[PDB]
Symmetry: C5
Amino acid sequence: GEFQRKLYKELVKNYNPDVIPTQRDRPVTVYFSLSLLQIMDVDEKNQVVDVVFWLQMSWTDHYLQWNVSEYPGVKQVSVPISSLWVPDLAAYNAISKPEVLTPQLALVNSSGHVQYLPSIRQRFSCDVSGVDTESGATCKLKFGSWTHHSRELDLQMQEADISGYIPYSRFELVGVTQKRSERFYECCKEPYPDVTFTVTFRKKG
Amino acid sequence: GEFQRKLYKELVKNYNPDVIPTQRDRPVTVYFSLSLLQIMDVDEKNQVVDVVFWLQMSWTDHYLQWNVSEYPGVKQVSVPISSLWVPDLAAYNAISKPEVLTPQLALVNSSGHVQYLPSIRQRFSCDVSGVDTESGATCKLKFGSWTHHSRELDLQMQEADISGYIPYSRFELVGVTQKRSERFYECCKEPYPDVTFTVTFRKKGRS
Amino acid sequence: GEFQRKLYKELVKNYNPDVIPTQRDRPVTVYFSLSLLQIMDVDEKNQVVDVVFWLQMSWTDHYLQWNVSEYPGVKQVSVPISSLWVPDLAAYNAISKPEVLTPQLALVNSSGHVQYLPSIRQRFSCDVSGVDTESGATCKLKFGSWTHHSRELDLQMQEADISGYIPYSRFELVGVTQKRSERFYECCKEPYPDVTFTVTFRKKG
Amino acid sequence: GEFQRKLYKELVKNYNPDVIPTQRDRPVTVYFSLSLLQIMDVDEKNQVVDVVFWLQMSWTDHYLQWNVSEYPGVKQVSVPISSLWVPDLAAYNAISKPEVLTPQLALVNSSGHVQYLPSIRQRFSCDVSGVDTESGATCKLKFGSWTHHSRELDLQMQEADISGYIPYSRFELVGVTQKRSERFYECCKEPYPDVTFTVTFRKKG
Amino acid sequence: GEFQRKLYKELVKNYNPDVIPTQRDRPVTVYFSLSLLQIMDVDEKNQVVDVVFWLQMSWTDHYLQWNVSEYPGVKQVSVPISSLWVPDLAAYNAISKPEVLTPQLALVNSSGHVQYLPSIRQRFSCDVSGVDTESGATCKLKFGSWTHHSRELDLQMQEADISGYIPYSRFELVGVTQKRSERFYECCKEPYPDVTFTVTFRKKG
Ligand SMILES: CN1[C@@H](CC(=O)c2ccccc2)CCC[C@H]1C[C@H](O)c1ccccc1
Ligand SMILES: CN1[C@@H](CC(=O)c2ccccc2)CCC[C@H]1C[C@H](O)c1ccccc1
Ligand SMILES: CN1[C@@H](CC(=O)c2ccccc2)CCC[C@H]1C[C@H](O)c1ccccc1
Ligand SMILES: CN1[C@@H](CC(=O)c2ccccc2)CCC[C@H]1C[C@H](O)c1ccccc1
Ligand SMILES: CN1[C@@H](CC(=O)c2ccccc2)CCC[C@H]1C[C@H](O)c1ccccc1
Ligand SMILES: O=C(NCCCO)c1cc(Br)c(Br)[nH]1
Ligand SMILES: O=C(NCCCO)c1cc(Br)c(Br)[nH]1
Ligand SMILES: O=C(NCCCO)c1cc(Br)c(Br)[nH]1
Ligand SMILES: O=C(NCCCO)c1cc(Br)c(Br)[nH]1
Ligand SMILES: O=C(NCCCO)c1cc(Br)c(Br)[nH]1
């Protein structure tokens, strides 16, 4: 679209994706949620889980807003994530780099709401010893900004989803939990939030 | 080519590959087809299919058209996909990133008709438990735009081809189905069209 | 050289590697030949060959020619392949991306005749069932331009031999064939030339 | 911040990441600590350890300092490591390239103090023969600047915490040591500082 | 370094890394040596060696020299290899791409002497059948410029070090040889020199 074209030239003009879009004394609040789609495998020897997650991440980038009157038809845009600031979310218990399965694009509202919803396959460190028991194995997968404290990036949880879980596969879900936390670290003087996704699973039969 | 050199400079001038080439209240209709070339392997433990396919994809980019009078000989061009807008097609049941086996180039017509025909090797999540049975295993491989709804990107099926299927290999094809749908998500108004490629296969030696 | 440095500045000035260097109603004729250096492995289950090839591709780019009088010493130069137009040759039966083992450089004449001679390791789909037989297994490895027809890119064979073949290794060569063909597709009024490298091999003893 | 863009624009237009930020006859002192998070696996045949480390690297880069008057709110910034000079630390006994698990960003103070804290998964050459013994296997993992001598880059150790060690897993820690040294090479006559991380571990039971 | 920053600006000014730094009809002499650090594994089926080498490559790039009077403190600089011309050395018997383990930097003197000393892990084609014998298996690993002949790049060998060989590991060294040769090819008027590293090893008792 010619109205869409005219906007991308502006949404680029003075945009630096390395800059966290904080506004005078206010953190960027980032909404976060993980959905376990499939437990691919477990390594009982090496103590690891091979898992496929759907991530729901949303925030506001004030540098990404536009007047819908200036660009009529343009309600939303699909922007490549490389073109924009994305939260520096770390998987604290990941033992492999993330494999992003879905197109690396984000949707952007006229008010600057960024929605990045990737499917990630990753391997995590976990005590899988009790996978063959009724109690099952429990993985506490922790995620959070690696470099931004609470006053810069406010991590918040959003409504989760266990409808996406693959019905076939050796593993059945005993329980799933998501909890947001905040702690002070001896290092920093400033606090840091995190979201912990907790899974309890077991081998079927 | 000489006019070809002059055209590539212009076909770049004001082109943004991140912009969907929709024209005033009309979606971009993308034609899509998938041809199963070979089922590489199955993981009965992990419930996965390793598959090779030929993707037939095409659309009209109204920003890519040119006057053949301005560029005589130039009927078509081989453009790298990275230089142009391509549909953001997601493999909904993929459990590995796609491995593109062919050159990453697209053929473009004087009227903006782009044809991207890659060979992809990818691993998908599938219930392969019945692979050793006469009924066989069935994989419902779903594909569609990740960010564009039906009124921005109109996914359409084109006539598919099962002549490309490798005659050797452990697996024989019981049946192949192609269906286009429009799914509504709780998230949003406006539906999301998808093409589901359904395969029924079985081990040749299952006796 | 101080002419070589100036030559590279000019050989870049108005050069687009995305443009096929066809000149007025004439296709670019590309000379091609494969030499099987080693059959690494066979997967009898998955029906695949892991092979190491030496490719000899050579063509003439008219935009790359220069006056030797303008650049005295400069007879030839080593240009990175990424800097120049290379034929879009596809391995039709490849089931893995090519692993290029040699430096990614091509040699270029004062008349613009380019020579690209890489060693590639690639995995191909092949009926390897008869590898343990006296008749042996036969692989018909097809190669050709993915996007250019006969009137744009004229694929031509160069006679290759089998002197490069590794003498050790489980596999002995029963026969090697190379044939150039021209195929028509329902799509296109103009045909697509290809070179098929055919191997017949068997496990030793 | 509005000044964050100002900051990133100038600390891009004038900063050369290739330049070691030494200031006149004074080396850059780099603080270094390694924390063993998990021993993933051991290869008794090939004599290798697959390990997950948390690295703590800090130094002062004088080219990255600013007064707060220059960038009002701006106290710190998350800069991509590719934008900065980072110590050229080599893992002398690594037999695989490092897999960096965390976002590749570093924190910079207004007084030029850089903090790079990556989680790395890497495979190292080690004599793992005694892993099944009470004495256990000992890995002497050596790290240091590959190209900078003592008078350019002053490697210094910091206090390492073994609090991060994964409680589950086949391997228990008998002992962990860190020693900084300065070696002489026949090449140079200026010494090369290094930190050797020594682990003694054994299979549980 | 204030002068260092001033030096990197000039060392960039008109530098093209694609250009071999030959001076008016004189070849660039490159010093080369290889040091076997460890034989990782052998594949008796596929006929391959997995090896870790330390490479010592040195050459003089006349475009890289500077007056030490113009830049006081600056005796040497660590430049990323990507920023400068490096010899296009091919591993003629490599069946995998090289895995470079060490930082990809080279040291450069005030007189243009470049020293690139990487640790490479690579897999080579080799007749490993006799690895379990007293005679042992012999690998003739050939290396040389892929595109430059004797009059452009003069390959020379330097001091061979076997002190770096890992004492643990299944394999003991029977013998190591390095020889430089000047091969003539039917293709070309000018000879192509090469260095062949020959190893004889065997499985320990
Ligand atoms: C990085 N770290 C905080 C800062 C910080 O620790 C730190 C900062 C500066 C100096 C020393 C330590 C910032 C937010 C994430 C948090 C992560 C957690 O600590 C951690 C460290 C090591 C492995 C796993 C997890
Ligand atoms: C991505 N999603 C739709 C939008 C949306 O979900 C959504 C949008 C905005 C907010 C929250 C959720 C767009 C069309 C595709 C669909 C995909 C499906 O989720 C999905 C998730 C995981 C595996 C397979 C498929
Ligand atoms: C890509 N295709 C031709 C063009 C074309 O078909 C086509 C063009 C335009 C529209 C529809 C179809 C050009 C020459 C190569 C050929 C490729 C071969 O089919 C093929 C595809 C997949 C695996 C093996 C072989
Ligand atoms: C690279 N070397 C020193 C430099 C140097 O030797 C050297 C420098 C210049 C010329 C010749 C040799 C500097 C600091 C690292 C040290 C490491 C060791 O060599 C080495 C090489 C390969 C594997 C393990 C260890
Ligand atoms: C590449 N080749 C020479 C050039 C040349 O032969 C050649 C040149 C032009 C046309 C045909 C052949 C240059 C120096 C190295 C030599 C390498 C060897 O061929 C070779 C090829 C494949 C695997 C291992 C070795
Ligand atoms: O690994 C993750 N982030 C680190 C960056 C590595 O390039 C990550 C974040 C989330 Br949410 C997942 Br699941 N993985
Ligand atoms: O995986 C696919 N797209 C996502 C790319 C991001 O990693 C994909 C699309 C189609 Br059609 C296939 Br087959 N795979
Ligand atoms: O795979 C090949 N070419 C296309 C690009 C793949 O990503 C290829 C061509 C030849 Br000749 C060989 Br051998 N492989
Ligand atoms: O593989 C080598 N060079 C080719 C470049 C990558 O495609 C190589 C050179 C040396 Br010395 C070794 Br050891 N490997
Ligand atoms: O491998 C490491 N550095 C060099 C990479 C160049 O390719 C490395 C450094 C440290 Br500290 C660890 Br743990 N690994």
